[PDB]
Amino acid sequence: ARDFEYNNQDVNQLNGAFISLVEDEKIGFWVGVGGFAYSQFIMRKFVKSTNIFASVTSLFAGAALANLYTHQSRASYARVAARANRNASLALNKLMEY
Amino acid sequence: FYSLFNFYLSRIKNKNNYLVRKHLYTTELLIELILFKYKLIILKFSSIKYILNFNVRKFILFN
Amino acid sequence: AQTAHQNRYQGGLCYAQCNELFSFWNPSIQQCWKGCDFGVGRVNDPEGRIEAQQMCKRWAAELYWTYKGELDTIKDLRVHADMYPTTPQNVYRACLAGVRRQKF
Amino acid sequence: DLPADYGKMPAGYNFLTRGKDWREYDKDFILRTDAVWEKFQLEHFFRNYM
Amino acid sequence: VCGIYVIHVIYNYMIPYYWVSTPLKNDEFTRLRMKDYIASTVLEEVYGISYAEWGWLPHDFAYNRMRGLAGYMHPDDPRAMCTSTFHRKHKYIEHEVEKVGDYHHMTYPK
Amino acid sequence: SCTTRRFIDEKEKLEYSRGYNQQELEASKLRKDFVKKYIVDFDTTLYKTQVERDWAYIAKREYRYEVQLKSIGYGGALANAVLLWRIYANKKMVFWPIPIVGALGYLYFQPVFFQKSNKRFFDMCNVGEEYYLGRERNKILRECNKILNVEDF
Amino acid sequence: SDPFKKVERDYHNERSVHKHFASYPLKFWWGLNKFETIQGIHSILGNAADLVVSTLSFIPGVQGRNNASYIENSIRVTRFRGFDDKTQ
Amino acid sequence: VYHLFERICNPDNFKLSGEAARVRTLIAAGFSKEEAEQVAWLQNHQVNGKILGLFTGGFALYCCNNYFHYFERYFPRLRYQPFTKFLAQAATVYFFFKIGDYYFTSRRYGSNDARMNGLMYSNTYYSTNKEALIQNFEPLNRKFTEEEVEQFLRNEGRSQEEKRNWIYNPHIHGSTEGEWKADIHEKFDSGKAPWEREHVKAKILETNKAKIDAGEEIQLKPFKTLNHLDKTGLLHRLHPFIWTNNWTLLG
Amino acid sequence: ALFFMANTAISVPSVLDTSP
Amino acid sequence: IVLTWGWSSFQIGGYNYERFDDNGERRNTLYWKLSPVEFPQSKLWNRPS
Amino acid sequence: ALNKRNWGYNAHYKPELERSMKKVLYADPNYKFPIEWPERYMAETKTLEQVMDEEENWEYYK
Amino acid sequence: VFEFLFYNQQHKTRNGYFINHDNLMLASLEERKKLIFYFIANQVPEKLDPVDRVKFNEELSDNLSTKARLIGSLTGLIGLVGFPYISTRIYSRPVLNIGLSLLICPFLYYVGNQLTYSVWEPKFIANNNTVCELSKKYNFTVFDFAQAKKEAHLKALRTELVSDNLLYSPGI
Amino acid sequence: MWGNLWTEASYQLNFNIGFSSLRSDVLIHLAQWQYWWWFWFALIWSFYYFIILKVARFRVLKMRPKISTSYRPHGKWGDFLACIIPLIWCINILTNSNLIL
Amino acid sequence: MGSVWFRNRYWWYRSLYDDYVAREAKLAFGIAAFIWLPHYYWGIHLNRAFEV
Ligand SMILES: CCCCCCCCCCCCCCCCCC(=O)OC[C@H](COP(=O)([O-])OCC(O)COP(=O)([O-])OC[C@@H](COC(=O)CCCCCCCCCCCCCCCCC)OC(=O)CCCCCCCCCCCCCCCCC)OC(=O)CCCCCCCCCCCCCCCCC
Ligand SMILES: CCCCCCCCCCCCCCCCCC(=O)OC[C@H](COP(=O)([O-])OCC(O)COP(=O)([O-])OC[C@@H](COC(=O)CCCCCCCCCCCCCCCCC)OC(=O)CCCCCCCCCCCCCCCCC)OC(=O)CCCCCCCCCCCCCCCCC
Ligand SMILES: CCCCCCCCCCCCCCCCCC(=O)OC[C@H](COP(=O)([O-])OCC[N+](C)(C)C)OC(=O)CCCCCCCCCCCCCCCCC
Ligand SMILES: CCCCCCCCCCCCCCCCCC(=O)OC[C@H](COP(=O)([O-])OCC[N+](C)(C)C)OC(=O)CCCCCCCCCCCCCCCCC
Ligand SMILES: CCCCCCCCCCCCCCCCCC(=O)OC[C@H](COP(=O)([O-])OCC[N+](C)(C)C)OC(=O)CCCCCCCCCCCCCCCCC
Ligand SMILES: CCCCCCCCCCCCCCCCCC(=O)OC[C@H](COP(=O)([O-])OCC[N+](C)(C)C)OC(=O)CCCCCCCCCCCCCCCCC
Ligand SMILES: COC1=C(OC)C(=O)C(C/C=C(\C)CC/C=C(\C)CC/C=C(\C)CC/C=C(/C)CC/C=C(/C)CC/C=C(\C)CC/C=C(\C)CCC=C(C)C)=C(C)C1=O
Ligand SMILES: CCCCCCCCCCCCCCCCCC(=O)OC[C@H](COP(=O)(O)OCCN)OC(=O)CCCCCCCCCCCCCCCCC
Ligand SMILES: CCCCCCCCCCCCCCCCCC(=O)OC[C@H](COP(=O)(O)OCCN)OC(=O)CCCCCCCCCCCCCCCCC
Ligand SMILES: CCCCCCCCCCCCCCCC(=O)OC[C@H](COP(=O)(O)O)OC(=O)CCCCCCCCCCCCCCC
């Protein structure tokens, strides 16, 4: 049975953005792990603070580092997907309006 | 139920014996509470701009 | 009293045209206002305009006693300032005038 | 499909229902649980009013 | 305030009484109705229906709405022309009329 | 209708003093659950038709006066009596019993008043089978009639 | 239990109150997904859990994520895509 | 580093974000432009009371924090327990929050009078819109049939500006000219929705017989939020405010 | 006047016909 | 003498009259929906008429 | 369009029963009512004999 | 300070509420059908027959929902460890301990539940025999997916509107 | 008594105080208007109670006479301010009366 | 609620009557805040009776 077909241009743009985002997230996981390890090492050796506080700070530092690394692909895919979703929603609403 | 049971146990332990080393997690929680109280006092009696400048200077010195 | 608006100013340009058409003491203005209300949303349609005219016939018939064929046999459908709603023909003619004045 | 003459009165038609089955009209009307009470009230009011 | 009210009464009810005192050959009814309009259509006994909810309850308003339409049914009535419309719903709550103008008879509001 | 309202209230009082059997208690529980779900704990304005919204609210308003307000008065009266006791005991003004005891009294008196007037609330929802509220009302009525081996309107 | 009753559609049940007052103080934490740092922390934790599951997948009955499958990657990448706290 | 610089120095950061964010999010979700606008307005009205209450509570605290110290005369618990003072401040903030939420979200029924509609003396617009939405919202519990999907696909390119000139080709349309013209008029020109056709309804019932046996009603017409939400109130026959409008509704 | 009656019982609905 | 008796006596009387006398309703009627309503006390007897 | 109302004109019967034959006759474009709505409230002029003859000679449109 | 606190946010990152046309565009035919069926089953079960609803609910509870609830409960217990957090033989600070527990435990529950979903939802969608069979059976379309998305958003809005009033609401 | 239909409209007793009948819409409106007429006097009645109480308790020569040194009155718009209350009375009378008319 | 709105309160008293009854006027508000409740509630019942 026939079904609604999305725009090929939007599909290709989403494919490129999705590949970029998947690669960036795969790299950013290890980037964040390394950042957390480095922050924990620094805190445990040079900073006189509570162990729980040091662990929380290291986790936040790792998360921030990973987000900084992966932001570009995340934002690019987010905008591309938002535009594609808006276009598809408008087309479907126009088709089904009664 | 859990709160009542734990309060009873804590009261019994405190009234029975107190010279026993406690867990690191609980000690750290108490340390954090005391430091939080002191920091609240400092914030109440100091300006936000001054706090920010002092923290920035301390971070620069640490680096 | 029998129009669709609590005062003549709420009514659009059709009510103002009705006042201009008739004298200030002529109570046929109210019948013109009824024609305006009937013509709302109908004048801009070829079938709607006929429907509004039929609404005028029923409105005149319910207001006054009338016979079958009087409104069809009216000689002149035009209205002057000193025309009063004392007969079905005057009511029908006034109602038709309001429908013509109605724009939307 | 319609018989192309739906609504036409049959020739010699008589407005009688002597042998009609009323059970087919049951689903076309709805009666409330207090239909019996309403029936008596209707009879009582009409007798005492009219 | 009384002086202004009296002046308005004189303008509407005293001076116009003398305009016509004999039979008129041309447009006698039109000329008589001209002077009668200013006196019979005063807002003193015409205004109020727009704020009828101040004294008419929802169910009372509905009953009075049909009473008013029947009472002011005569087309030749300048007072009805100046009176506020009866084709409207109670501002607080309406129980009989769902939509204004959606009737089964051009005169009866129901 | 004031005569009818008085008669209904007196009938409920006599029935409560009389007591209830297994069948009557079971029927009352079904009515009480139906009223609470469809009236007390539901926004009446969310029904479809105006007729059922209006009558459902009338039942809800009637329930509020006959159960909620009455329970609050009785709960408050019990709380006030305890408040007077504690004031005399302590020779001062005490504020704790007012909230706590009032809530306890309301919880104690709400079930009894709801049981007393459960039938009236259920019957007021008989808008008609043409509406969702009436259809559910009729369904529960049939179940209650089956349980009680009688017929009711 | 009787999950059939819960599954059954009902006007009153659908239009009744589902979230009560007590749930708000116990569930307001879900709004932290608005923050990029919180989203990154959750992504890191999920990736670590996936790595652990994949490493322990050697035992029967446990299967880790496979990068070949498109659905797993799409879900893991678009979980927080387009999040907006101002729209219900 | 280039992307970090881009993020820092994007002019959008300096530009103040508008209310179009909700509309864009709703459009992405699936709502149409008008439906998105109505839903965004409803959400904004719902949240404005809470925002205003929070702001009022913050302002009241910033101004009259000294009242908490003053009340230590009658409640020394505040003086001897700062936790009590913090709880009191939080309670005041929550009280203002609740006041705002009640003002902007509570039913607060009022008259439908053009002389005061929209002045916020009564929450008439929001109450009516919420009630209509909740009452008339019923999710489509069907699966779009093959005929409906085909009609949706065929609708592509239609425009009400100019009616399409339908031309009958026997070798590709089949049937007879008159029957095909009648079918086309029913499908497109008449404006009748696909689900209103008798055969479509019969197929829907046959497909969803299981739900019918279970006792669930099948909604032929999908819910149209634009047919029940109207921030202007004209759909619900709410008289527009006199001083901001130059027209009247019969009601 | 404006609110001379001081209250309106809008709750009281139109009596519903119950004839069979 | 001045305030509390005169602002509450009539309302107390009307409330009691409804309690024990059904606001003076005449019974033996049919179909209360169609029957007229016997209004509670509305003329303030304490206030000089 | 919003302010358009029928104002109690041509308020003929609107069948609700699915199988009522009125629901189809009124739907028929070529259906003629016994009398036009405006004339339904106007006094009759034809004599009784003339009215009877017209009704006898009247023929259903179908 | 804004909606993210006093507005519902727990349904925006679970049960496939985030599935949109972007996933479907890149998905193949079978994957698109699986995603559409999963979204419809999670957000608008009414489109499914009662037997399918029961089966899908049981599978979801077994795999993702109840599992995440259990993991969140475990994390909440981890948070509760050490209770009371601060106390001594003089005072126990019951109110402070209760507040700390209220602030800490539900946060850990939410973290655990979100972790469970992020870890297992993709695997459940991709490699569930029941979901695959039901998706093949129903064979939803893009129009169905759009309708389901709109209906889910309307359902969330309706839930928020109904929960607006929870203390006093006579109705008139 | 037109049959069982009791058409009697008045059932006033020997010591009736109210209107003879309340079936007429005119009397219902008058009865409702009069009842609320008395309602809108809470502040005025309380005010007169206190001035009566004060004068009867302290203004006697025995308790606390006051040396009235004022020579002449200086009111200029107290009449306008006071006349709001009777003005409202006139508005209520006109509104209720006209609606019946 | 009266003289408070005026920044010349002596003028407010002089210009109205040159008499001072403010004490009784401002004390009467407390009594007037509750003296009307039985009348108001009975009127609500009476209004509903008229509506029925
Ligand atoms: C031991 C403890 C044990 C505890 C036990 C108990 C535990 C209990 C359980 C507890 C559980 C808790 C769990 C939750 C906790 C964590 C929650 C959380 O996520 O919070 C972190 C949350 C994380 O945020 P995020 O989601 O990651 O941020 C998004 C990214 O920015 C993404 O944004 P973007 O990148 O797309 O665009 C913004 C762009 C930057 O582009 C811009 O320039 C943005 C400009 C925006 C508009 C500015 C308008 C200013 C004018 C006034 C306001 C006008 C009205 C409009 C305002 C609109 C809103 C901004 O940002 C960048 O790219 C910057 C580089 C990134 C790396 C540096 C990171 C810095 C911090 C992030 C904020 C930076 C803001 C900079 C603002 C501009 C300065 C020049 O962090 C913050 O809230 C922000 C930082 C904190 C700020 C503190 C401010 C204090 C008050 C200051 C007053 C005085 C100054 C005021 C004037 C401003 C300065 C000039
Ligand atoms: C003869 C025997 C038989 C008798 C038969 C029965 C009777 C038949 C009689 C028939 C004839 C009738 C004749 C009628 C005419 C009589 C005239 C005559 O002789 O009297 C002349 C008498 C001469 O004047 P007057 O009464 O001596 O003038 C003094 C003012 O009346 C006095 O007022 P005042 O304002 O100057 O003094 C009080 C002032 C005292 O205060 C001050 O001055 C202080 C400054 C104000 C601020 C104070 C607060 C500060 C707080 C600071 C922070 C505290 C710590 C923090 C604690 C809270 C937070 C933690 O209070 C205020 O201004 C503040 C009040 C604020 C309350 C209002 C706010 C409401 C909202 C609050 C909400 C709270 C709850 C929230 C809940 C939310 C959710 C539900 O009256 C007239 O002027 C003629 C009036 C004629 C009618 C027109 C009425 C309007 C014109 C104004 C006067 C209205 C009042 C007086 C009316 C008269 C009756 C009482
Ligand atoms: C310096 C300030 C000046 C302010 C401007 C207004 C005041 C001008 C001077 C006084 C004359 C006011 C006449 C107003 C009415 C004129 C028209 C008229 O009579 O017909 C309309 C109406 C009559 O309406 P009608 O019923 O005839 O309606 C005619 C239209 N049809 C037929 C369709 C119904 O007039 C009245 O109703 C008059 C009632 C008598 C009392 C009027 C009091 C007016 C308000 C008080 C004004 C006080 C001013 C004091 C100024 C000096 C001190 C500051
Ligand atoms: C144990 C021995 C210790 C010896 C002592 C010295 C140790 C030094 C350790 C250095 C560690 C560096 C770790 C870098 C991690 C990067 C992670 C990442 O992805 O970041 C991407 C981001 C860039 O993000 P982006 O968005 O531009 O691009 C992302 C990358 N792509 C596009 C390819 C996907 O880089 C950073 O911003 C990293 C630095 C963050 C801020 C901290 C900086 C600290 C150093 C400042 C030195 C300044 C010197 C003076 C400059 C004067 C200029 C005029
Ligand atoms: C400066 C002077 C200013 C004067 C202002 C003018 C004042 C005019 C009014 C004066 C009223 C005087 C008091 C009348 C009390 C009537 C009580 C009554 O019968 O109940 C009415 C009302 C009528 O109730 P009802 O239920 O019978 O209603 C009337 C009858 N039906 C039911 C048919 C409508 O009852 C109550 O108020 C009940 C509670 C009464 C509680 C107080 C009882 C006081 C008894 C008398 C005083 C004590 C005895 C000794 C007095 C010694 C004095 C030195
Ligand atoms: C320029 C002319 C004015 C504008 C056009 C309006 C004129 C026609 C209506 C005026 C009279 C309205 C009376 C309504 C019935 C209430 C009577 C009443 O309470 O009187 C006893 C009261 C005092 O008696 P009371 O002490 O019993 O008051 C009631 C006390 N409680 C509530 C505790 C039971 O007298 C007044 O002072 C009433 C003044 C009128 C009501 C004002 C309320 C505030 C609303 C804003 C008013 C703004 C001014 C304009 C009017 C509003 C509309 C524009
Ligand atoms: C809200 O509260 C209020 C009201 O609501 C209740 C009000 O209505 C009002 C309105 C009220 C008013 C305007 C005032 C209304 C009237 C009032 C209060 C007074 C009414 C008084 C009465 C009805 C009492 C009756 C009067 C009498 C004089 C009775 C006398 C009784 C007796 C036993 C005396 C009999 C004696 C005789 C006949 C004479 C015999 C002797 C002789 C001939 C001489 C003998 C000589 C020798 C030497 C032996 C107000 C002000 C109010 O505040
Ligand atoms: C969440 C669970 C965990 C526990 C937290 C519970 C939170 C409960 C709800 C919020 C409670 C708010 C109150 C907090 C404690 C009291 C804060 C305070 O001191 O506020 C008063 C203060 C006035 O300052 P003052 O020292 O009196 O200065 C005198 C100048 N002549 O004025 C201020 O400093 C302003 C206080 C504003 C309070 C919030 C108002 C709502 C809107 C806030 C908008 C954002 C404000 C951001 C401020 C950033 C400051 C760095
Ligand atoms: C500037 C930073 C802060 C900015 C935000 C300020 C918000 C002010 C409003 C109160 C905030 C309380 C803390 C955060 C709560 C977050 C969740 C939330 O607000 O949930 C909603 C609910 C109240 O919502 P409500 O309007 O009553 O219900 C309508 C539902 N449709 O919430 C509640 O009912 C929760 C509050 C109930 C009242 C509590 C009063 C005492 C204070 C208790 C604080 C918590 C305990 C902290 C103890 C340890 C720290 C000291
Ligand atoms: C002798 C041995 C005894 C062993 C006893 C073991 C008990 C284990 C179970 C403990 C209770 C688990 C409850 C789970 C509820 C749940 O998830 O119930 C199910 C609902 C589902 O809602 P969601 O769909 O939003 O997840 O959960 C919630 O609503 C979450 C609410 C917050 C839960 C936080 C739990 C923290 C830990 C416990 C403290 C709770 C404090 C509450 C406020 C005072």
Numbering used by the authors:
A (entry chain Eg): 2 to 99
B (entry chain Ed): 65 to 127
C (entry chain ER): 2 to 105
D (entry chain DF): 9 to 58
E (entry chain DJ): 111 to 220
F (entry chain EM): 2 to 154
G (entry chain Eu): 3 to 90
H (entry chain Dx): 2 to 252
What do the authors report?
Mitochondrial energy conversion requires an electron transport chain (ETC) that generates a proton motive force across the inner mitochondrial membrane to drive the essential adenosine triphosphate (ATP) formation by F1Fo-ATP synthase. The ETC consists of four multisubunit membrane complexes: complex I (CI; NADH:ubiquinone (UQ) oxidoreductase), complex II (CII; succinate:UQ oxidoreductase), complex III (CIII; cytochrome bc1) and complex IV (CIV; cytochrome c oxidase). Here we show that a supercomplex containing all four respiratory chain components contributes to membrane curvature induction in ciliates.
At an overall resolution of 2.9 Å, the structure revealed that CI, CII, CIII2 and a CIV dimer (CIV2) associated into a 5.8-MDa supercomplex. Masked refinements resolved individual structures that together form an assembly of 150 different protein subunits and 311 bound lipids. When viewed along the membrane plane, the assembly of more than 300 transmembrane helices displays a bent shape, indicating that the accommodating membrane adopts a local curvature with a radius of approximately 20 nm. CIV2 is associated with the long side of the membrane region of CI, opposite CIII2. CII is anchored between CI and CIV, highlighting the unique architecture and composition of the native supercomplex. CIII2 in our structure is tilted with respect to CI by 37°. The interface involves 20 subunits and 19 bound native lipids interacting within the matrix, transmembrane and lumenal domains. Our native structure with bound CII, which contributes to the ubiquinol pool, demonstrates that assembly of the supercomplex is not limited to the proton-pumping respiratory complexes (CI, CIII and CIV).
